[PDB]
């Protein structure tokens, strides 16, 4: 079964399963009409990395920054658009996402939905709404600073 | 030639009685003839007016008469 | 001329006699017992399709004066 296995990554920060797509192996696939409102974002990883102090002796920060640099190389930011990247500080640019799939409106008025309260502290619910190295965020939730 | 097979018992480009083989009349030739001043724009242009205005020669004329082809004309 | 005169059959004409300029007989039904036997055999020969009533001969000319367009832009 080493030749028959569904691909499992350890770092989904690129959310590759949205891009590199492998067919469901099962002969019976289950497709409801309900699953259109399900956002398919990757599962919450262990070692939430954005909490890490970027200490030069810290192993998890080392492996994370080499991961980020390799992601930058595979998307060709690092050689190309941005030739020299010193990785010093641990950066998190987070967005107030509601995880709503498409753009919505108000049922009560017909207005655009009001701007959400800016996020105070980072949470696990907030994790995929950040800017990671390589991932995908919906346009509908990127609407605010 | 006997190494090559026969095709289509009459022959490939074969004339028969009633094959419609038109001699071409290019639309460019016509428009040149009109803007040059051989032919009336004011008038229904028949094959007769083409023969009389000399734009097409007697030799070119054969049954069935002509085809109007647009060669290098976009308007 | 096609859309006014030609595409319409004779006003009396039945379906079988449609193509004739004047209907050769009155009744549309085949009027000869031999012709009727032949039409029965024709309708069981070809399976029973709508047009099978009218006899079409099994053999062909392969002549260019009867052939029309195989396929092309309408």
């Amino acid at each position: 079964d080493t030749m028959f296995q569904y691909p499992v990554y350890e770092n989904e920060l690129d959310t590759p399963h949205l891009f590199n797509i492998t067919e469901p192996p099962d002969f019976f696939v289950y497709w409801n009409v309900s699953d259109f409102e399900r956002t398919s974002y990757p599962p919450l990883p262990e070692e939430d990395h954005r909490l890490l102090l970027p200490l030069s002796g810290s192993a998890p920060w080392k492996q994370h920054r080499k991961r980020s640099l390799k992601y930058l190389r595979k998307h060709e930011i690092l050689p190309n658009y941005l030739p020299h990247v010193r990785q010093d500080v641990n950066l998190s640019v987070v967005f107030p996402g509601v995880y709503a799939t498409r753009a919505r409106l108000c049922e009560e008025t017909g207005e655009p939905l009001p701007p959400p309260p800016p996020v105070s502290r980072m949470t696990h619910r907030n994790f995929w709404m950040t800017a990671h190295c390589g991932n995908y965020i919906e346009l509908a939730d990127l609407q605010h600073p | 030639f006997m190494l090559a097979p026969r095709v289509s018992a009459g022959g490939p480009r074969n004339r028969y009685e009633g094959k419609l083989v038109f001699s071409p009349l290019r639309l460019s030739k016509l428009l040149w003839a009109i803007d040059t001043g051989r032919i009336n724009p004011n008038e229904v242009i028949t094959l007769y007016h083409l023969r009389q205005a000399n734009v097409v020669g007697e030799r070119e004329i054969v049954w069935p008469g002509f085809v109007l082809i647009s060669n290098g004309v976009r308007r | 001329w096609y859309e006014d005169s030609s595409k319409y059959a004779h006003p009396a004409a039945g379906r079988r006699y449609s193509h004739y300029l004047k209907p050769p007989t009155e009744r549309d039904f085949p009027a000869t017992v031999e012709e009727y036997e032949m039409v029965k055999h024709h309708q069981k020969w070809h399976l029973n399709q709508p047009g099978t009533g009218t006899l079409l001969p099994w053999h062909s000319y392969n002549t260019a004066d009867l052939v029309k367009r195989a396929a092309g832009r309408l």
């Binding site: - | 030639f1 090559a4 097979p5 026969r6 095709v7 022959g11 490939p12 074969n14 | -």
Partner: protein, 60 residues
């Protein structure tokens, strides 16, 4: 006047070309003796129009 345009040419070939360069083209015979057993590629290398050899073209 047309004596030499013999029809055994006109059944076999057909000439294709722009003025001052014209091939005579023909199909291949290997066909009507043994089709089966050979292979499909060498069989359908027979369905293409091909220019005759230039000597024969000059000769005809």
């Amino acid at each position: 006047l047309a004596q030499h345009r013999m029809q055994v040419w006109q059944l076999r070939f057909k000439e294709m070309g722009p003025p001052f360069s014209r091939v005579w083209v023909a199909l291949g015979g290997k066909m009507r003796r043994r089709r089966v057993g050979r292979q499909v590629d060498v069989k359908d290398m027979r369905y293409y129009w091909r220019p005759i050899e230039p000597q024969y073209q000059r000769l005809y």
